[PDB]
């Protein structure tokens, strides 16, 4: 029973750690994608404003 409980606890801890790491990675990837899209939109708007100012 001790061996079975230790194996089950180790498996549960590994699964929980993997799930937490995957969730953190997904959140970081989503944040990076949103930041990149916002930066691209801001750069495009700034370029358009600069072209209008030059005209």
């Amino acid at each position: 029973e001790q061996l079975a409980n230790a194996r089950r606890d180790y498996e549960a801890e590994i699964a929980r750690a993997r799930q937490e790491a995957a969730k953190i990675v997904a959140q970081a990837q989503e944040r990076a994608k949103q930041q990149e899209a916002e930066i691209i939109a801001q750069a495009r708007r700034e370029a358009e404003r600069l072209k209008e100012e030059a005209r």
Binding site: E46, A47, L50, K51, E53, A54
Partner: protein, 49 residues
């Protein structure tokens, strides 16, 4: 910085087009002057060479 460089490029293009648009401000005037002020026999004397 690239936008500032492009603005400087546009300023230089406007400066060049000021002379490009001065083609009619000079060529037609010179032609009219040669038709009137130069008239005929305005060939001077090429004694140097």
């Amino acid at each position: 910085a690239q936008a500032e460089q492009e603005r400087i490029r546009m300023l230089s293009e406007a400066k060049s087009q000021i002379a490009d648009l001065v083609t009619l401000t000079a060529s037609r005037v010179l032609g009219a002057e040669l038709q009137a002020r130069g008239h005929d026999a305005l060939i001077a004397e090429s004694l140097a060479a």
